[model samples]
Target chain A: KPIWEQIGSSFINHYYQLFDNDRTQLGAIYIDASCLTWEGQQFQGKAAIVEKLSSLPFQKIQHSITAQDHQPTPDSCIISMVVGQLKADEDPIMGFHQMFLLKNINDAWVCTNDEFRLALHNF
Target chain B: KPIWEQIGSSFINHYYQLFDNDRTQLGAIYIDASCLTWEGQQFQGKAAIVEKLSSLPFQKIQHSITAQDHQPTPDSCIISMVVGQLKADEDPIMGFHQMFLLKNINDAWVCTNDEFRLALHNF
Candidate 1:
């Protein structure tokens, strides 16, 4: 396996662990210039991203990842997409698709770009 | 909208047109260096990618895009993810998630990397 594969897998494990446990700690994996697109709404910078994540309106949630794919880009960034289902506090499980761009900054992986959406077809 | 936004949207439109209508035409958007990860199976180069796409088990299919998000990487490549539903042959509609990395070559947008999944969680 390529180095990116192992690194990407590790990141996935670390990410959801933080997300399902304490999303507030996720800010450590991002930088000031990071960008996030959550359900079509955009947030830039670590503070904004962390704020939006912390305020998701659910106290307890769990994410069950179904599949994930990762790639290495020309600029040395890792692009990964995760497909999963999530259960909110009292809501039923919902399908979700998320993509992230991880760049090595100072020997650490930082998410530079992230986009998330619910796999819904109803208009 | 940013330039990448319109270009990404256009590429998504052109891509599905080729996929649902005539998938063989999809080769034009890929390069010899292109790579694809279809449901975790790897296919490299245009020939392999095209062959894999052309050999899908279904004869007729349609993709209905539910939502799409695009981002511009530092290397000038465009990363986009499409969340949708697809109906293949006699099968019921199935959710799907696809991500594409488009890079400009000789003034034309070409897909350098693609990853696709059926969004199924069945064990």
Candidate 2:
């Protein structure tokens, strides 16, 4: 498989494992939200950031890769899209704006960060 | 030197180059913003996104590391915090909430994707 495809596949699989709560294979991807300054609000690292994701009670998840770009030097890539599905009756109520960062290390790819801008569409 | 420090230093130096438009040494970190949902808004990828940053008129740039965490697998880590500086009278105003993804490829570290939530403090 092409490098990007391999990386993307790994990311998709990882997300599935995360939603499944498969902690054994599920390695943590640390998140820093301190630089996120939108509308005068700042969110710090994983604990504070995860608080927002955790509040969502996100489950029944599905993610799609709409687009991607890769930089080969350090071996990195970013995938973008409405990268998830959530069951109804969740907090933070989801919709889209998700991005995943992948890095190539020792010839294998692993995710470093996964973040989304929460969106909800009115029916 | 510890791996994280080396990785962090590379990131800091790269950011400086980015602000300076020193494309020779600066690399591109592809971003996916499709999952960003806030106040009923969604942002996807670099082009749609830089528009927002460009509006800020940011110029003077300085970045500080508030905190970070790393996972040593085959090799990858995530660094978090307010990671940037901006000058007044430039585009994108300037602030914090930045996170970096680094991967060990061939035993060296490089950033994959960088994103921040912008913030501005009252003077």
Candidate 3:
């Protein structure tokens, strides 16, 4: 099976679940050195990531996956891409895209890089 | 200066230039086994990449980078994220996100994995 078909849905499902509820749960998937780009902001380290995510303006959010793809790189690392719709409370649904680069560290998979982008209608 | 501030603009500039023109020029930046994800479609290998890019529906394209971030992974690879605006002909500008996993192969930097996502207004 394709890499995306093999791991996309389960990983995404767990990711959003943690995002919507206890974002601290993400610590297991990300390391202290992980790099995250949300929208236009940069957050480095797990603590920074958790702080930024927990402080978002929206109180509740829902995500719907539209498409996903993934591939294994030469170094055995995996890069996964997710394109989705995000609705925050009563606000209009917005476009969302997230990419994660996973590496095997100590026999477990952890995200080394996480990038997120939100679609804006205006500049 | 941060890594993004150091290499973001030039890399992005050259990237789009190649993207909008003879995409075959990408061969120098991506290897024969590189992986690419475009709006969720997966394309592996340089030949597949060139074919897909050459067949994009839009005849003319422009990319405006709004935000960029990067970090060096544990394995010495670089992960870069770019959030930008994409305009195709008369269509309204749309949101775009691209992530690249770069490695130094034979003393030259090449993209080993590339992921792109387009923001959609509706599901």
Candidate 4:
């Protein structure tokens, strides 16, 4: 079995590359039952998730990952957490964090859960 | 079934309170099969996980949660991601992210997986 680190890094790289280059294609990494929480906005199913990504407000975005950690769960799932900075359109660079739960389906890793949040502390 | 929103917010509050007040008591929230990845370092089992948290440097640390999102996985586990700022022992405020996978065990939610990372980018 591959280390959780290897699987996580590989998946993250592919996911973001697709995200930055063409977000509409991002749904290929997810299954029909996938769930996504983008900045607390929830979306379920592959179609809605893809629609949400495609309809995002920013047209230009680049993600720069700062650090990531992954762990293999008791149920044979890989939990990956990523922290990074991103520049969207002309906005100032902002901090963001994303986590994914990946499970192997017929030997192919698929994301079943995703949650994203921007780091903004005003209190 | 309780709304995921309720469970997530409740858990985050209790977690930080424990972490801020008495991290030693934090082990009760984890089980022996739990896995934790802290800044890329990995620890398994409840004993090591607790030891790692207890041995962390800096005594006076406060976590300011900016936002959190949660999803109930198909496997009945709750996946929660949080991003915020933290100050450790008078150090400059730094952004951080943490994620947890909570599984119900014996009618109690126990952390089955955890991953934490601080946000730092210079590239």
Candidate 5:
């Protein structure tokens, strides 16, 4: 397996696990200026991302990843796309797609950009 | 504006114009296997993306960009984020966020990853 694939797989798994357990841990993976898009609302910085994720209404959420793809760009940057299913509370399993742009800084990989979208029925 | 900023601004403007006029023109901006995420459905490759965009129901569409940000990564790649309003037909204007990961290949900047998300109020 490629290094990017390994990193992407573990990062995504860790993300959801923390989303359910300890969202504060997200700060380690995201930097201060990291940009995030949830649904369509944009949040800048790790503080905002943590705040938003912590305030979700649902108490329990689960993610089932169906596919994961990664690309190593010209720079040391890595782009990863994950397609998955999200089931929140009793809601139906909704399809979701998340992308992360990661870069190594100071000997560690951290996300610079994160985007998440939910599959709308009507498109 | 910096060169990356200028390129980012015009590229987005041209993209929508082409999206409305001739989607086939998108080939110039997106190469084969370019990944696109709309709502949550993932389309890979230029052909699939063009097909998907062409099938959208709204005959007329417009994009009003409220904010645009660009970053030049270490490997000469450009990451751009655009937040704007999308109005389709008579529907109310909806908020949207789009991110593009572009690379210069043979002197032309082409998008390798494109993600679009519509703001869902209910979250």
Candidate 6:
């Protein structure tokens, strides 16, 4: 519910806010995306997402996402595969797999976390 | 029917052969995992997997898989999440989110493909 919307908006806001860093705000939004952390890397939630944004130092960025083979269950939905592309600062295109964990809390669907899997990077 | 067993053995052979590279046998075992490819990336099949092993220059490799929150559907079972780890050549502990697509062929479960998602890497 809120998670898919959150993902859509987060993608937009994060792209624009990257270059206009207000350190505190960036950190807050980046952290909002984080819901859990395993191994040592941060598995992002909404809060962690805010943290990600407030931490960036850029002027412009763009985000693209494509979800495939998505399956919905009683409690949650499994996006079999999600591909993401990011473009910023003439930087070589970067891509990752975003496994969105959504839960129906009360009446609304909310994103619990963004389980990120870095796919590829080029310089 | 042969998919699950295929996945299990593929996992095993891939791990062992990473360090022990041979030309002909490796090619056969490697290509057997492929089912499809989107965007030029060869997502492995049983045959493709053989190619992977044959292409490798190592003599030894090992594979490990863990499944979590699996939900079986009328046609397929969704492993809510899966994590894999591979060790070789001082490799940076490679891991990925494997979304397994299994279908019941005749009366058995077989893996359609191994959807690989790179989780992280480090020094």
- The lDDT for every candidate, in the order shown, is 0.84, 0.42, 0.77, 0.85, 0.74, 0.43
State how far residue B16 of model 6 sits from its true place (Å).
Answer: 12
- How many clashing residue pairs appear in each of the predictions shown? 0, 35, 0, 0, 0, 66
Give the DockQ ranking, best first.
3, 4, 1, 5, 6, 2
DockQ metric for all predictions: 0.33, 0.06, 0.48, 0.48, 0.11, 0.08
lDDT of 4: 0.85
Question: Candidate 1 chain A — worst ten consecutive residues by lDDT sum?
Answer: A114-123
Model 4 chain A, TM-score vs. native? 0.93
lDDT of 3 by residue, A10-119 (tens): 66678889887777688877888888878758788888988888888887888888887788888987888777778888887777778888777897777888888766
Please give the lDDT score at residue A114 for candidate 3: 85
Per-residue CA lDDT of model 1 for B25-114, tens digit only, reads: 999999887878898887867899999999996578888887788877666788898877787774656677889989999999999889
Q: Which stretches of candidate 4 lie over 4 Å from their true place?
A: A120-123, B88-92, B120-123
lDDT (tens digit, per residue) of candidate 2 on B10-114:
666666556555332333433333222112233344554445445433344434443333223223454422333344445545443344555544554544445
lDDT for each residue of candidate 6 in B52-85, tens digit (9 for 90 to 100) = 5355544555444533223233234322234555
What is candidate 6's lDDT per residue for A1-123, written digit by digit as tens? 435344444443453354244434433323332343222245345555555544455555665664332333323433335556667667677764554444444554444444444434554
Which docking band does candidate 5 fall into? incorrect
Taking the tens digit of each residue's C-alpha lDDT, what string does model 5 give over A1-113?
76766887777778778776776678888888787878757788889988888788887888888766665554667777666678888887777667788888888888887
Each model's fnat? 0.27, 0.02, 0.54, 0.68, 0.00, 0.05
Better of 1 and 2 by lDDT: 1
Q: What interface RMSD does every candidate have? A: 4.7, 11.3, 3.7, 4.7, 6.1, 8.3
What TM-score does each prediction get for chain A alone? 0.95, 0.51, 0.88, 0.93, 0.90, 0.54
Q: Kindly list the per-residue Cα lDDT of model 3 for residues B17-57, writing each as its tens digit.
A: 88877576777888988988887687999888878877886
Candidate 4 lDDT over B54-113, as tens digits, reads 998748888888677788898988998877777776565656778989988889988999
Q: Candidates 4 and 5: which is better by TM-score?
A: 4
Please identify which of the two predictions, 1 or 6, would achieve the higher TM-score against the true structure. 1
Q: Pick the candidate with the highest TM-score.
A: 1
